[PDB]
From a paper:
α-Methylacyl-CoA racemase in M. tuberculosis (MCR) has an essential role in fatty acid metabolism and cholesterol utilization, contributing to the bacterium’s survival and persistence. The enzyme enables the conversion of α-methyl-branched fatty acids derived from cholesterol metabolism into forms that can be utilized by M. tuberculosis for growth and persistence within the host, a key component of M. tuberculosis pathogenesis.
Crystals of the three MCR mutants H126A, D156A and E241A were obtained using identical conditions to those used with the wild-type enzyme and diffracted to 2.45, 1.64 and 1.85 Å resolutions, respectively. The overall structures for these single mutants were very similar to those of the wild-type structure, with small root-mean-squared deviation (RMSD) differences of 0.38, 0.37 and 0.38 Å for 693 Cα atoms of the H126A, D156A and E241A mutant structures being observed, respectively. The three mutants collectively had fewer hydrogen bond interactions; within the H126A, D156A and E241A mutants, 3, 5 and 5 interactions were observed, respectively. The active site of the D156A mutant has the fewest structural changes, as the H126-and-D241 dyad is retained along with the associated hydrogen bonding interactions. Within the wild-type, the D156 side-chain is hydrogen-bonded to a PEG molecule and a water molecule (which form part of a network which terminates with Y130) and a peripheral N152 residue. Consequently, as this D156 side-chain is mutated to Ala, these interactions are lost. The rate-against-amount of enzyme plots show the expected enzyme-dependent increase in rate, while the specific activities calculated for wild-type, H126A, D156A and E241A were 46.4, 3.2, 18.5 and 12.2 µmol.min−1.mg−1. No significant change outside the enzymatic active site was observed in the three mutants, establishing that the diminution of catalytic activity is mainly attributable to disruption of the catalytic apparatus involving key hydrogen bonding and water-mediated interactions.
Author numbering:
A (entry chain A), B (entry chain B): 1 to 39, 45 to 359
The structure:
Amino acid sequence: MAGPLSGLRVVELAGIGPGPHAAMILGDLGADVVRIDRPISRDAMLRNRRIVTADLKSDQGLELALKLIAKADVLIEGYRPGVTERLGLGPEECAKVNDRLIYARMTGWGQTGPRSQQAGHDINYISLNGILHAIGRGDERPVPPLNLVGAFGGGSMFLLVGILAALWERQSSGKGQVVDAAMVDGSSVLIQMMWAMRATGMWTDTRGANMLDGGAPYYDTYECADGRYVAVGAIEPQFYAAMLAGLGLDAAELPPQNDRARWPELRALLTEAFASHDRDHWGAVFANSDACVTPVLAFGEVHNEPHIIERNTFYEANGGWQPMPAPRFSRTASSQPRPPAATIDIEAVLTDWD
Amino acid sequence: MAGPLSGLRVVELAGIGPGPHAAMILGDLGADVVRIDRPISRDAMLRNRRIVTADLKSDQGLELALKLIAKADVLIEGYRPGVTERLGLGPEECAKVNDRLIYARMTGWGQTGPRSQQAGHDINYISLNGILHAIGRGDERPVPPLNLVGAFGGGSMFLLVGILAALWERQSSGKGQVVDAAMVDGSSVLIQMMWAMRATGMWTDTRGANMLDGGAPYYDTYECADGRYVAVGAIEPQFYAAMLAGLGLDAAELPPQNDRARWPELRALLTEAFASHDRDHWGAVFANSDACVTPVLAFGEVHNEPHIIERNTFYEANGGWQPMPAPRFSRTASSQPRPPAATIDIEAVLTDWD
């Protein structure tokens, strides 16, 4: 199995959202992941694993799971706190058979505290820590940024960081430990720059009125003649200048870039410029310069974009595209993911594991 | 220094956005991070660092930087590709002094390809891979989800994963390597769930008309009588039933939860219910339930929320609050971050590092 985590053994207790995503990325980087599900997937996310079946509520399944866990470097579970405990698969039980295990617990609210037994989803976790409130236009209610911020950015990615950091600690202690990755916590650290900025006057709690939330005319999308969009990210003065040039606007005729009192006027002039031609026209004008202007591609258009083609950011699968592994490693590169295959018998994995 | 990465040595070449975020989290987790800037910060992101200065364009500075790098496990750089090369700090030159070094390159477009030399920001990177198009209400142009998706979720967090993955690899190969972390790639893996779902009809390219983007009435925010908001994430039927129960809506008088043709009617009925009382009302109603109904807190209110208090998700620093380290480790816990301190002498760090 190619990639830097070749040799790592992972047991994933089947769930939804951040747990399978973390398992996926360990698999993409070369780990040997075995997912235990209840008694061929069409779900590209279940790439790079073996799937086995056991009833964990039964003496036989629990015993088979414990044998797998005994041989594993990492366990991923994403149930409510207390669930693995009552199944016989809690950290203290696993430590009995394997004190080198990294026991990685992926929740929204965390292992403890007043909400920790309450159901939730991404939207809920980013609602409680200020994030959701900060997303969207000022004249509308907050819009969810899909489940990119709680489940993945602040969820699976922090579980991964915790797993891989604990493996580093294990090299000198000779032991594992439990990683408590809560989406409410990871997402907060993900947005740490905004928490920094609020202490210095560089971020307000006022929605849709900041440098990076669409409040700034030079950091936003604009609708083009064809009803399609471009994105403008020209924060630096020189990038801003290149953008005005591409639009054919004379800077002398415009308000200063950071005259906030005249931002409505600047936005209006930029709106009128972009509206005067179709997205593809601006994509060509701005293809090479430092103007920080890009066409806003829909998913179905991405695979035709030159920078996307040349770097092989995606590969074909199941009639559609899936992203290749990231990040990229110069010496122990990952390969193209292996599709979800047929279930295997669990005793065969146990056999293979030495 | 407390946490799982105690003992790791990181050199960060001072930059903006994802590179310092990555260095911060390594420091948070106990790493010994030394940031080289140009010749006391009030930026909380520069927590858990020693800051030194060197002119990398001068013979003397190049030499001091190489001596630091010779003692390090990790180098983080976020310049345009080619920049460290021309300075004499490129991967090949570092390898001559330290072939164990994990050389972590944090860019938007990646090391190679047609855009690799072009300026950009977060909004640009997520515009070319389908992400930005997917964010926002269907009747408005796309809205940037701050810089959480490109810079951090699909940026620093992939850099971190690659650093820690390559450290794992080194434990068996004895050697380091280069990590090419491109925000355009990392963000695409971040959103894999959507790429998977597109192939099975579980996600469409139509904006604002899916399960997780505000298209679904049970997965969205709602404005309350006070003009503040709740978030509803009640996907599963039993959570949805609990949400109806709290509102006191009779399900027999409503459209079925997943009759999409009647989602306008469902939304309007939910809108009228949540608008009838203030946000804090709904916190009382839904207490201890699985309704997936939470208050949408502004940043300035977060520190008063009981679940946030009880778990010490934040700590007080400088102006306001800053997020504590995440994720959390049972045996080698991180401690409260060290503030930015005065610049120190680079020869002093070398003496420290030997």
